[PDB]
Structure 1
Amino acid sequence: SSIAPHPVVHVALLPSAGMGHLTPFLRLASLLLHQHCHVTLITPQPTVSKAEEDLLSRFLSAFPQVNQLHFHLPPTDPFFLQFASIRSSSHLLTPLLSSLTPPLSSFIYDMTLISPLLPIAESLGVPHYILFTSSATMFSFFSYFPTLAKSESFPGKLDFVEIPGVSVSSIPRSSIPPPLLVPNSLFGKLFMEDSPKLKKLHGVLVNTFEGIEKLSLEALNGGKVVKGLPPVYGVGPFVPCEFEKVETISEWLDEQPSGSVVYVSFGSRTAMGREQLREVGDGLVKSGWRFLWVVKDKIVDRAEEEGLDGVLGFELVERMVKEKKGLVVKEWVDQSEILGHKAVGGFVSHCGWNSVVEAAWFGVKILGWPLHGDQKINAEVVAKGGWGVWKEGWDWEGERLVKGEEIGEAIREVMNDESLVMKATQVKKDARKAISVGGGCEVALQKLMEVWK
């Protein structure tokens, strides 16, 4: 008895600094657009890196129906500095969010912004959420932090973190993210201020799935970690999207035998010291395997200033050009196009979380080389599933010099192991189940959409 336009579900999104935060937010935006949502994207500007700038430009051109709200920031690790700048200025956003049309339905923001955005979301009167961009196991640690910090000996006497029922049952002190043991650090301060406020959220979205973190997901939603935690929605794996693409790399890969290439990358914001970097190349040559090595000499891509031949040195460059087995680049690559190529049989990775979930989506086994932060916990999430391995004696980047001899031996050990491929293929199979009807991601998004309507 009526011919009416259907009311629109309008979601607002706010990502913080780095490609490891921007990429999952934009993949979530694509998922929401395919559910016929209207999306507003708040963009803090300028970005720390050029790669962030360029990805946003390709996203907006692909989806002109997205409403961009500019967030011009006022004028240490450059990405951590941006985390603090966005957090300290977020209290100014209220006028831009309260005048949104059509009426806002929900608000999903970065995990590092809980405290300043909670009163803003309360005034908007809509359900609000964090998108947590690391593993569900690390989210359990974050939620558990007030339980550990109440002790009078914290953080001096803490040898094991054992959260009931999660995917990594015992986290030793050597795997705790170093800033969490330093009360005055940025993340140590954010953990203490923000974790007690998790109970005010409507929910927590995580880019993960039952095939890789079954136990952590069940413990978080069973009241085992902390009583009164908001529900945790496993909405991963986030499938890589078309707008991310920017041809000699793909042409080189086309000429290599299937499964014969080892891909090497330590993410978008980490650069090894020059001596350690040169040991990586020595290990790749000694391994005897074909390789595609992505190099960074600076944390921030904008700051690169020396050519690859000067970074690598004459002796290493000469060895690699003579053997004619490897390709080395110091530029932004299409990592998902590489991991999805049939030539790539293994992945030497720092185990940043987006890279882990991409490797799971493509069924590529991992040699884990965790370098900083939560990467040792993520490396063990992978090892528990039997589709990758890591050497706990290598330690955080810069604590010791890992030698080319032992790097080459570790590469041969992973590439000769067919059991790792067997488990990685089953992970790949469970990754597709999660997004199909009845899978964890499909079930979670339907729950959220019905609430927002």
Structure 2
Amino acid sequence: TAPPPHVIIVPSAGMGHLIPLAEFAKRLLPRFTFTFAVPTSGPPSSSQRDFLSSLPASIDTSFLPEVDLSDAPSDAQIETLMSLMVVRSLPSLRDLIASYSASGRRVAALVVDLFATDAIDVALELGIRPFIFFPSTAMTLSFFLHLEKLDETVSCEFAELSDPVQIPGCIPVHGKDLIDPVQDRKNDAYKWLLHHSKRYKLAEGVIVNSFEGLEGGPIRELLHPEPGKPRVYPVGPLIQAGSCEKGAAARPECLKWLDQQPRGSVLFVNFGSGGVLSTEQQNELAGVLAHSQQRFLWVVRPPNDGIANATYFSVDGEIDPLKLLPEGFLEQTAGRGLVLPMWAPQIDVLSHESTGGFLTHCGWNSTLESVFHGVPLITWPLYAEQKMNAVMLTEGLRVGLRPSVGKDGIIRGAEIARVIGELMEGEEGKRIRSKMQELKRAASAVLSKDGSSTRALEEVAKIWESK
């Protein structure tokens, strides 16, 4: 038996990046051992500790000594804070790598998050293969690689463009729909994003959680070799498994309800833990759901701008979101819909045969989970690159419908009802379902014993073991 080479992972964001990073590492076990070298600006969170400690033994964690970010403006976007966090943690990253190399272990590669590219300098100085793990779309990867050119050939704010931005190999996108950090070109967020995009060519490869059957255009453009463009390895869809392949067979309460409903008849509504809606926006959605004949399963959170404090609370002690719904919504909805507070077993809901639709904020892991299990989408993007994902999902793949937002930022009930009704019982909804089932089959194929994605993973492992 050969000694497993060691690989170090530097994440820069929260769970949306840890989950796919962990899945990537699990696919490569036990050939390698892994260390999550997590930069921090304070005591690690309980969810971080719990998620990383639940991983197989070959993946351990090191929470780097926290850096001081108090000098940054309180207006600083997360991109700026992540870049500062990684840059200031690099000496501790050297120390961690030293602890491994001084014991005789071979450090084969350094896998950096999309905002941790400054750690590539460490890898280069130590003779370690630097790779970038890209937990988003090939379309967003293409945009990153083209950001330099776009920055030089456009002076105004991108929203002010009248024509849609053309990214090599992707559907056009309006400047207003481009990622959050580029909406204020004067903010440090944009300068950091630009700085990181120019460093992708320093890596030996970019590992992207997508596949050609989902993003044909961008992936074929990216695989086409050009000098100054890194190798790209499509390995998606990397997603967690369901609780069926976990352990005890105890059934959550929402899945009991889903069994009682008929096939493909429930619209799952989940904006994610960072998708709090205003009171008005949540009232517009509730009103449509109350007057609808559609069965739904809706995860709700306390709005961000309640006129008054909370009066009701849950046993744990947090604000009770259900007592904030409109008067009589719960009685009006009983039987047809089930409202859940804060969280739900998303993957298992999407794998349920009764689930027929998914109203989502278009987080890429959620998109990938919906695609793998074949649940068509209502694309309700909110922040980060979700608007880009929505354009590609609705106007490119045509596996969802996007409700138009108003001039005040509100998606009125008319648009919510339009997309719900079309998806769940219109004629376009059947064509969208057929297409999504085709992508479901393509997603299982690339993960097959000999598929596009499994071979790309094998290529990465081979490169790491080489030389």
Give the partner amino acid of 1:184: K
Structure 2 residue 196 is the aligned partner of structure 1 residue 194? yes
Choose the corresponding residue for 1:311, options 317, 324, 338: 324
Q: Is the Cα contact below 8 Å between 2:374 and 2:436 reproduced in 1?
A: yes
Give the share of equivalent positions with the same residue, in percent: 30
**CA displacement, residues 299-324 of structure 1 (integer Å, 9 cap, x when unaligned):** 8xxx9942123322334333223xx2
Letter in 2 for 1:163: I
Task: Count matched residues.
Answer: 432
Distance 1:56 1:199 in 2: 30
Q: Which has the higher contact order (CA 8 A, sep 6+)?
A: 1
Secondary structure of 2:62's aligned partner: strand
Which residue type is aligned with residue 444 of structure 2? Answer: R
**1:320-356 Cα shifts (integer Å, max 9, x gaps):** 23xx211111233221111111111110111111111
Query: Alpha-carbon deviation of 1:220?
Result: 1.1
1:318 and 1:402 map into 2 onto residues whose CA distance is 24
Name the structure 2 match of 1:65: 58
What's the counterpart of residue 309 of structure 2? none
2:220 maps to what in 1?
A: 218
The worse-fitting range, judged by mean Cα deviation, of 97-106 and 332-341 is 97-106
2:285 is matched with which residue? 280
Shift of 1:110: 0.7
Residue 298 (structure 1) shift: 6.7
**Is 1:113–2:116 an aligned residue pair?**
yes
Tell me which residue corresponds to 1:138.
Answer: 140
Would you say 1:431 and 2:424 are equivalent positions?
A: no
Inter-partner Cα distance in structure 2 for 1:272 and 1:139: 28
Map 1:108-257; keep pairs closer than 5 Å. 108-114=111-117, 116-151=118-153, 153-155=155-157, 158-159=161-162, 160-164=164-168, 166-168=169-171, 170-223=172-225, 227-241=227-241, 247-257=252-262
Is 1:14–2:10 an aligned residue pair? Answer: yes
Alignment equivalent of 1:366, drawn from 377, 397, 422: 377
Matches of 2:180 and 2:321, distance apart in 1 = 31
Match in the other structure for 1:410: 419
Q: Which amino acid aligns with 1:437?
A: K
| Secondary structure at the counterpart of residue 366 of structure 2 | helix
| Structure 2 counterpart SS, 1:351 | coil
Hey, what's the Cα distance between the residues in 2 that align with 1:110 and 1:220?
19
SS of 1:400's equivalent in the other structure is coil
TM-score for the superposition, normalised by structure 2:
0.85
User: What RMSD over aligned residues (CA atoms) do the two structures have, in Å?
Assistant: 2.6
Structure 1 residues 305-314 or 433-442, which shifts more?
305-314
- For 2:296, which of 287, 291, 297 is the aligned residue? 291
1:203-239 Cα distance to aligned partner (Å, 9 max, x none): 101110111101100101214xx74210111110013
CA separation of 1:248/1:450 partners in 2, compared to 1, >3 Å: closer, same or farther? same
Contact 1:27/1:241 (CA < 8 Å) preserved in 2?
Answer: no
Structure 1 stretch displaced more, 305-314 or 13-22: 305-314
Following superposition, the deviation at residue 79 of structure 1 comes to: 5.3
Q: CA deviation at 1:446?
A: 1.6
> Which SS does the other structure have where 2:410 is aligned?
coil
Shift of 1:195: 1.4
Letter in 2 for 1:342: E
CA–CA distance in structure 1, aligned partners of residues 275 and 48 of structure 2:
15
Q: Could you list the runs of 5+ residues in structure 2 that have no partner in the other structure? A: 69-74, 305-315
Native 8 Å contact 1:270 1:298 kept in 2: no
What is the 5 A alignment of 1:336-355? 336-355=347-366
* CA shift in 2, pair 1:152/1:242, >3 Å: closer
Q: Post-superposition shift, 1:16?
A: 2.2
Equivalent position of 2:37 in the other structure: 42
How far apart, CA to CA, are the structure 2 residues paired with 1:426 and 1:310? 41
Taking the aligned partners of 2:227 and 2:282, their CA distance within structure 1 comes to 45
- Which structure features the higher share of helix residues? 1
Asked if the contact 2:266–2:296 (Cα under 8 Å) also holds between the matched residues in 1, the reply is yes
What SS does the aligned partner of 1:105 have? Answer: strand
Closer, same or farther: CA 48–249 of 1 in aligned 2, 3 Å: farther
2:20 and 2:239 in contact (8 A); partners too: no
Question: Secondary structure in 2 aligned to 1:106?
Answer: strand
Which runs of no fewer than 5 residues in structure 1 stay unpaired? none
**What's 1:329 paired with?**
340
Cα gap change, 1:278 to 1:52, in 2 (>3 Å): farther
